[model samples]
Target: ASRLYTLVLVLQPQRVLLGMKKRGFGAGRWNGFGGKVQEGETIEDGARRELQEESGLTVDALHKVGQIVFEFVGEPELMDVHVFCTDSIQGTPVESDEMRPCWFQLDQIPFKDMWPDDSYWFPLLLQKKKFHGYFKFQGQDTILDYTLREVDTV
Candidate 1:
C-alpha cells in the first residue's frame, strides 16, 4: 500500500496560499502545506494539523478536490497525496521552521518552482473540479509520464 499524505490549498478570489519549503523533502520549492498522516488522525485532521504547523492558518471548510499518486522511479514508497481546498480560514499565515508562507495570484503561480505535476492538476483545481491523477517521476523535477482526469469526487 502507498503511504498517505495530504496537501491543502487555501484559495481566495484569485489567489492561493503556498509555502516555500525551508528544509527536508521539498526544500527550495513552493508547495501547498501538508505531510504524512499520523497513526490515529483522520486524513482531514492530518491535513489541518500540517497546515497549522507549517503556515499558521486554520481551514474551516476543507473541500477534497483531488487524489494523486506519485511514483518516484525505484523508490519503495508511493506518495498518495490527498488534496484539499478551502476559501475560508481563521488565521493569518505565518512562517514556521519548515515553511515560509506566501500567497500567489492564479496568474502568477510559480509552477516552475513546484512539483511538475502541479501544472496539470492546478487548472482543474482553479475551476473547482474534482480529480484523480498519477505521475511517474524520474527525479524531483522530472515527470516521465502522468495521467490526470476530472472526477465527480476525489
Candidate 2:
C-alpha cells in the first residue's frame, strides 16, 4: 500500500531553503518540509502547515510540481509524495526541535546529504521542469533502481 505525503521547496532567486531534520525519519539530512497529509486537510494545506511548522515560513500558495513514489525495498508501504515549489514566501526560517533551517545556493545543493532519490529528480525541478518519478531504495543512501521523466504538466 502507499501512504500519501506532501512537501514544499521554497526557492529564492539563487538559493533554496531546506531543513536539517533533527529527528525521526530523514534525520540529519537536508530535505524540504513535509509529512503525512492528515484527514480533513488538503495536500497543499498540509504542505503549507508542515513548511511553517518546520521552518516558520508562511507560504500562501504552492505550485504542485511533481509526484514521486518511493519504494523502500522490502517495506510494506510506499510513500506517494506530492511535491510543491514556490519562490513566493514570507516569514524567516526558525529552527525547531524537528529541524534546523538553512539556505543554500542553487549551484551548491547538498544532494550527497539528502535522500538518495533526490539527486535524480531534483535537477529537473531546478530546471523548472515538471516531473514524476519512482525510486526503489536499498537503504538510506542507495537507490536500487529508478525512473524519471519530465512532463509538460504536473
Candidate 3:
C-alpha cells in the first residue's frame, strides 16, 4: 500500500526554508518539512502541522504545487507525496528534534545533498507551475527512470 505524505516549502523574498532531517527517512539531507498524513486531518492540514512541528513556523495559506510518487527498488510501500509552497508565514524557523531549520538562497540550494528527483521538478515549482511525477529508484542515490510533466492543475 502507498502512504500519503506532505512536503511544504516556505519561500521568502530571495530564499527558501529547508530543514535538515536529523533522523528517520531522509536523515542527513536538506529538504522540506513534512511527514505522514494522519487520519482525520486533510493533506494540507498535515502539511501545515508538519511544518510547524519541524520548524516552529505557521503558514496561513499554501499553494499546491506538485504531486510525486516515490518508489524504491525493494520497498513495498510507495510514498505518495503532495508538495505545497507558502510565501507568507508566522514566526521564525526554529530547529526541532527531527529537523534543523535553515534558509538557502535560490542559487545556493543544496541539490547535491537532496533527492535526485528534486533537481528535475524543483524548477517547475519555482515557476509556480503544477506538476506530477513518478520516480523509481534503485537506491536513494540512483534514480532508475521516471516521468514528469507540467499541468494546469495538480
Candidate 4:
C-alpha cells in the first residue's frame, strides 16, 4: 500500500482557500487540504474526509486535477499525491486541531510560509489550468525538479 495525499481547492469570490495543517515538519505553514489515505478507504472518500476534517466544509463537485509521486532517498516508500479541485462547497472554514483554514488573495499568497515549489504551480492551478509536476526537496529547499508540461496540456 502507498500513502496518498489529497488537496481540495475551495474557491471563493475574491480569493481561494486551501486548508492546511498548522503543526508538523512544516508547522504554521500554508498548504493544500489533505492527509494520509486510510486503510480500506477510497481516494475519493479520503479526499472528502480530509476536506471536511480540515476546513469544516462539504464539497460535492470534486474533480481530480493531477498527481505526483515523491521519492526521497533513505525513505522506505514513496509519497503519492492526488490533487482535486472544486468551486462549490458548504459551511465556512474553521480552525481545528490539525488545521487552520484561511483564504489567500490571488495576488497575496503567503509563499514564504509554504513549501518552496508551491509558488511554481499554484498560480497555474488558480488560473483554472491543470498541470503535473515533480519537485525534489532537501528539507525545505527545492534541489531538482521536472514539470510534465506547462499550462493545461499535462
Candidate 5:
C-alpha cells in the first residue's frame, strides 16, 4: 500500500492563499493547502483539516479533482497524491506556523517558487474545468512518464 497525501487548491479574492512550507517535502516552496493523512481520518476530512490548519479558512464545499501516483525511487516507499478543489469557503486566510499565507494575482502566480507540475493542470482548474492527471518524478526531478485526463462539471 502506498502512503497518501491530500491537498486542497483554494481560491480567494484577488489571490489564492497558498502555503509556504517551512520544512519537509515542499520546504521554501509555495504549494497548495495540504498535509499527510492522519490515522482514523478520511481523505476528505484530512484535506479539509489541513486547509484549515494551514490557512485558517474553512471550505464550504470540496470536490475531488484528481490524483497522481509515483514511486519514491530515492526512498523505499510509493507516494499517492490526492488533489482537491474548493471554491466555496468561509473565514479568511491567515499565516500559520507551518505556512505563511501569501497571495498572488491571477497572472502573477509565483510559478518559479512552486513545483513544476503545478504549471500544467492548474490552468484547467482555474478555468473551472474538472481535470485528472498523473506525473512520475525521480526524487525531486519531475518526469512526465505518462498522463491521463477526464473532464466533469462540479
Candidate 6:
C-alpha cells in the first residue's frame, strides 16, 4: 500500500527552522517539520498541522515546493512526501515531545546530522526552486541509490 507524508520547512532570508526527532523512523536526525498525512487531511493540511505541532508555529502561508520518494531497504511502503515551504509564521518555535526545535543560519545548516539525501535537494529548495527526487536507503543513514532534479513545477 502507498502512504503519503508531508514536510514543512519554515525559512527566512538567512535562516531556517530544523527539528531533531526525539523518536521514531527519523530519530536522531535533524530535519524539517513533518509527519504522515492523515486519512481526512489534505497534504497541505497535514503539513500545517505537523508544522504547528512540531515547532509551535502556525504558518501564515504554505506552498508546495518539492516532492521526494523515500524507499527504505526492506520496507514495503514508500514515503511519498509532499514538500512545502513558508517564510511567514506566527508565534515563536517551541520544543515538543517529538522534536527539539532549532534555528540555523543558511550557511550554518548541519547537513552532517541530517539524511544523506537532504544535502542535495535542500540547497535547491533553499534557492527557491521546485524539485523532485527519489532516494533508496539501506538503513537510517545511507542513500543506496538516488535521483534528484530541479523541475518547472514539483
Q: Which 10-residue span in candidate 4 carries the lowest summed lDDT?
A: 145-154
lDDT for 128 in candidate 3 is: 85
Worst 10 residues of 6 by lDDT: 51-60
Per-residue accuracy of model 2 over 1-154 as CA lDDT, tens digit each: 9999997889888999999988988988999889999999988888988888888789766899899999997899999999999988887889988999999999899988998788888888888889999988887877878899988877
lDDT of 5 by residue, 1-154 (tens): 6888887887755566687888777788998988789899999999999999888989778888777666645666666878888768898788888888877888888988898788787777677677666667766646646575766632
For model 1 the local lDDT of residue 92 reads: 93
| Position 145, candidate 2: lDDT | 83
**Per-candidate TM-score against the hidden true structure:** 0.97, 0.96, 0.97, 0.86, 0.86, 0.97
Candidate closer to the true structure by TM-score (higher is better), 3 or 5:
3
Ranking by TM-score: 1, 3, 6, 2, 4, 5
lDDT of 4 by residue, 41-140 (tens): 9998999998888778888678877676665545666678887888788777888888888888878888888777777777777777777767565555
What's the CA error at residue 105 for candidate 3, in Å?
0.6
Write down the worst ten-residue block by lDDT for model 2.
52-61
* lDDT of candidate 3 over 1-154, digit per residue (tens): 8999999999877999898888878788998889899999999999999999999999879999999999999999999999999998989988899999999999999999987898999899888889999999997789998999998889
lDDT of 6 by residue, 1-154 (tens): 5689999988899999999999987899898999899988889999999988888889779999999999998899998999999988899999999999999999999999998888899989888899999999998877888998889978
Give the Cα lDDT of each candidate.
Answer: 0.92, 0.89, 0.92, 0.74, 0.78, 0.90
Worst 10 residues of 5 by lDDT: 145-154
Where model 3 places Cα greater than 4 Å from the true spot, the runs are none
lDDT of 1 at 78: 96
Ordered list by lDDT, greatest first: 1, 3, 6, 2, 5, 4
Which clashing pairs does model 5 show? none
lDDT accuracy of residue 88 in candidate 5: 84
